[PDB]
Amino acid sequence: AVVTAAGLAWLRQYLNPMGPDTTSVTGYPDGSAVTTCIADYSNTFNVSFPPREALYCTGSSSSEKPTLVDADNYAKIDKWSNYDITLCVLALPMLRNVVMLRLYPHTPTAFALTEQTPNFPQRFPNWSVYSADGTRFNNGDEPGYLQSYVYLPNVDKHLSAARGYRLLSRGITGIFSAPALETQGFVTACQYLAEGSIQSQSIKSDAVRSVTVNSDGTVKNVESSSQTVSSMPRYVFPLDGDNCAPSSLTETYHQAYQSKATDGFYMPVLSSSRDNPFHPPQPRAIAVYGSFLARGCLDPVSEAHEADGPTHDIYRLNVADDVAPLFNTGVVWFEGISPKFSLKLKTRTVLQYIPTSGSVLANFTRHEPTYDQIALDAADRLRNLMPHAYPAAYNDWGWLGDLLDSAISMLPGVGTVYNIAKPLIKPAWNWLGNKVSDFFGNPVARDG
Amino acid sequence: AVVTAAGLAWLRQYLNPMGPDTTSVTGYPDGSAVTTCIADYSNTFNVSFPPREALYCTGSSSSEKPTLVDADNYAKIDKWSNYDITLCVLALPMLRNVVMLRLYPHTPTAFALTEQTPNFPQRFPNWSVYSADGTRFNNGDEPGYLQSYVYLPNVDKHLSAARGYRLLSRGITGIFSAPALETQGFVTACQYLAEGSIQSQSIKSDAVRSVTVNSDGTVKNVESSSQTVSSMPRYVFPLDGDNCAPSSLTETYHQAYQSKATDGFYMPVLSSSRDNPFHPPQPRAIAVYGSFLARGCLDPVSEAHEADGPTHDIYRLNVADDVAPLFNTGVVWFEGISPKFSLKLKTRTVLQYIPTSGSVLANFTRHEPTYDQIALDAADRLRNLMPHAYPAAYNDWGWLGDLLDSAISMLPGVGTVYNIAKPLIKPAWNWLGNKVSDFFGNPVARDG
Amino acid sequence: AVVTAAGLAWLRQYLNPMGPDTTSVTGYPDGSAVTTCIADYSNTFNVSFPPREALYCTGSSSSEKPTLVDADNYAKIDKWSNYDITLCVLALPMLRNVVMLRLYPHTPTAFALTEQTPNFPQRFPNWSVYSADGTRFNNGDEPGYLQSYVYLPNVDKHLSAARGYRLLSRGITGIFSAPALETQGFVTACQYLAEGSIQSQSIKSDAVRSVTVNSDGTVKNVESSSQTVSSMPRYVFPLDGDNCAPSSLTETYHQAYQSKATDGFYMPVLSSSRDNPFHPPQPRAIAVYGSFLARGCLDPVSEAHEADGPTHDIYRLNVADDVAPLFNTGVVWFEGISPKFSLKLKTRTVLQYIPTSGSVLANFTRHEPTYDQIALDAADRLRNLMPHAYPAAYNDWGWLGDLLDSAISMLPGVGTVYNIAKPLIKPAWNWLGNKVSDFFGNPVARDG
Amino acid sequence: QYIPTSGSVLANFTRHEPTYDQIALDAADRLRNLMPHAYPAAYNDWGWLGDLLDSAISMLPGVGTVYNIAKPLIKPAWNWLGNKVSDFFGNPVARDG
Amino acid sequence: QYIPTSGSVLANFTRHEPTYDQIALDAADRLRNLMPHAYPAAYNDWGWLGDLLDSAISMLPGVGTVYNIAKPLIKPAWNWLGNKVSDFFGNPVARDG
């Protein structure tokens, strides 16, 4: 009838993963009655304009031979560094490979993805180049953008030795800095559910064509093996790359966060469901849904045109991982950024494990099978009205917890004891104009 | 603690889509906090016995060459027109192709479906013929039935330009008319959940057989490529065609609607779940599950008989669409209908969109992120006790809303303020015998 | 506002399927408003050490020729019978093939499964031998263990003639007996959700290699058909075979049951969800997920190494069935058992059907569309705190129903009438030490 | 606003709200001659608008007035160059950007 | 206890509980000289420990005491060979194994 302490702690760490008060770590309040070990991974990365030494090509040049550095095509990327640039970060719900960084000479119209599988995608300190025409880059082409994955190795090590897992919370902080008189730029951030699933794309086989012209050998096996079959199963994400441009995200989602570049960002990615069950680690190749070209059976056609129906393009990422289901995909854009910028990415990922017998995690187990329906219902309440992101320095929200959680905890059903906690009003998160008001109307003076 | 106005409006439009009072259009009460545009499609079609000009063949005759009219096999269909006929309408949850019309010389024992993919399925004004032996029809065969799809083009246009969608409500009205002294016939209607999913059927490849008899060429590649693989993924519906006969539906479902033909029908198709999340438009080829023939591994067998296990037949519809998940499939039968009938089909489909930037829908957005748990719980309450259909003229139900919704709104939990609203009794929808009583025992005198 | 009688009856039969008081049979309290027929299957089997006549080989020896008895390799199994043995029972949610029995010379480190598909898996009275090296057994090998499936034929007959089905409850009782002075041994039991799904493994095709050396025939079709495709779809269970050892299960799950062998076991398998919808009978080949070997795209690799990514091994069971989704998988181990033991397996499976018109089930229908939200919420409450198993003789629990169900029925929301029913404390199910206390602290003196 | 043509796209987004309000139109005619032609780009969500400015101006039109007095109205001074901005009721406007 | 090194495995299992308790440390220093060096293998879950022994010893340290008297403490006799074992408060210890 009242929210417990463990439920409140879980709610605070779920909504504010990188808050200063979040020191203790608590599990999901479902009373699973299983031996669990909760792991907290805090990582920091300093991303700036990469040098030539950490830049590789994804084209067919690096097909069999391993990663190849740029053959001093770095002059074009220096030309990029002449003017302002754009920096996209894309946080898919993958456990390792927490975010994908991408660098553009200028803001693109869409989050494009190469149709051919890239060769040797690079972890964060190294980058991989992609051409301007939306294809993989070989030496001598025109570079279009740079891409890298921010990888957590300890997550991989611990996921190997676990019966099951579930993501408890994840937050990404974007401390931005630039030289004086070069602080111009804008930051946008948005979360939305891209519910991926295990799917296989439709591919075609090859028909054999043998013409035996021998006097006794005249088989002439002209059989048509060119039928339509299913490819290897992959975990495909329905992220709308064509609608991932910053302006579309701002005008589509009301909780999207916009501010000046110097404010940075702080995205506490949120789950889209109220139940968070354990899952066995099942890494798979990740892919992203594209769009279809041939209408196929979308119009009255014949049998032969059934096969080439609305088959959506699947973009292989050449990255294997197991994803946290029902968790939002985040995307932030830094537009018009000075090329000599500096972004301190600080990611906190807290997730629960069921240890395997004889594994390392078995030495850190913790028996807290606490249960709290009120906390879960409050999270389901709050999911639809929290902002998608906050300024990087906006931690330790006063309204959270003793007011916001308390105010939202008595709507669920009528399971309420205290008559009235506090009236709740619609906040206005206008960081660009310095007219920010919280959920209770109290103003937010700038703390940074 | 009390149902809001928006929740009541959504509930009324969800349960009575074609009610006269449903003028305003309201979104799903979940407080999605997204920019949405709600589109209402009202369409009217006059279906009667088709002439020869609008009748095409689905057989291999129209394989490469486009649709072929009947080569004056129309005499047999005129012979159909000599006696009474049967008219089935099947409303699958497909967004476009709202219903499938089918014309039979007499009531079939099951809703059969051709094993081979039909050639050029026809939109409503045109029809396609299928043979009497459950196969596709070429000229010179014996026609078994006629089939057509009722297509909504504006739905396709708007679905192209949308990040996401969800079906809000759908209703189908069946105004029936016939010449005087030819009003005999019966109408049956039933809704049931056919939860489709993306599945691929099991097919076989072709083994190459090359016999090189040359003096130096004696390779003899006899390799067996004839293995079992997966076909193209399709959205498959588990509709029980073998159990779709009118009598079985009447004796299986208590809420099934039965009446005289002149009463018509009015089916407000209902969702089977309480959550209606947005989904990205992902059109796919539609198919229907059949039944298996070879038991396979249902009995102790060897390895070689693993492949030919219980593989269910999949009937390709040669139609591509994206379906509304968790929505009931409706089916109505008009049995013993005079051949010179006239059915006015009136379909109302209201569904929500997330507009894409720069699209047409962006000019009609409407920001109403209202939330109402009571309305959703009331819908979950009511799903299991509303009739599957009503007579075509039975709109503007008095019991709905201020009594039925109010009576059902205080069961959910104990979140109740008003002590007692109105006692609820079991209705008796006996339209055949004119002994209809509503949910509160009040009689229903015939209004048409 | 109060739990009905039908809801209480369903809850009692769901939590205590084999209780003495469970005489009447009641359906799921969801008010489906469908014609249903509830079938109760009670079966008894006497499993002991099999004789040579009922022992077959799974290897390639019995590939085309049917099941082959052991060519008097039974001396090694007699050597097994010299010392103590181990007996595992694995209750997957398959409707028929209720349990899988397995006999080991000594406790294994994991629940291994053969990589090659076994030939002719045997129903319970017969067994099939598997080698000690985790491979199928031919005559002359080293036997590793024996395996059999306990099959219910009436379930198959009734599932054939049904539109839909759902499992209502399932319980397995393990009455254990042994000769005097040979009662040593231990019993362990554990339930956990292994949420299976329809998946297809990644396989490879065969590239054709034709070398035409004729003077005019010089085609040289060297085309590479060796691409990666999807195999036949199968229902795959993510049961952790590597973590199914008894000790790991005991140390992982708090509700796992441990006792002496003579106590037997009684596992009332429980659902993992609160909704139990009807499903059409769709038998499929069953398989079990293994583990992957090649990391593949888990590390930065090229395009050619995308295919051999983290592809998990899929172990075909060569058994076709339709499973009850969202139901727990049970596993019990009898360790250190005297070889001349005797286990009376008593399985009770109660499940609901929607009869097909003209079928046998249509003669036993029963119209009880009762609805009870409180009972379902109470089941969701209780799922996480009931023991996974009880001693075989521990039926008719006093605490159940008028106390435990009543005590748990007033937590859900605040939909509560009676002020306080009874305080609930944490039970201690220490059957090994005879210090068992129930949910209310009352001791449990040994009744057997 | 549009009047949709039959069979056009707009016909799928119609909305029947034939509401009438003479007071609002008269208030707009009142206010046209005293609102500033422009504001700083960040000066949205004016506090004085609506519950004060519209209310203050809504009782001048004719004598169709119910509430005796809403709020006195004074002449604002929109001096953005010198940071001496005062709204229609004399309250100062501190710089929000 | 460990202080994890950055990037090590232990860093994934840290736990922030900087609790401080002088009374517990003083009680341990109190108790070190009067606990038996060993017990029978089956003699776990001592009844006297904690709510009596720790409580009885927790009010000797200094005079930082709130509760007037917890329980008198007497000299135990751990004679396991002769089955005449008495705990710190004189209660006998019947053989549990």
UniProtKB/TrEMBL annotation, chains D, E:
It is found in: Virion. It comes from the Viruses. Belongs to the peptidase A6 family. This is Capsid protein alpha. It comes from Lake Sinai virus 2. The lineage of its organism: Viruses, Riboviria, Orthornavirae, Kitrinoviricota, Magsaviricetes. The chain holds residues 417 to 513 of 520 of the full protein.
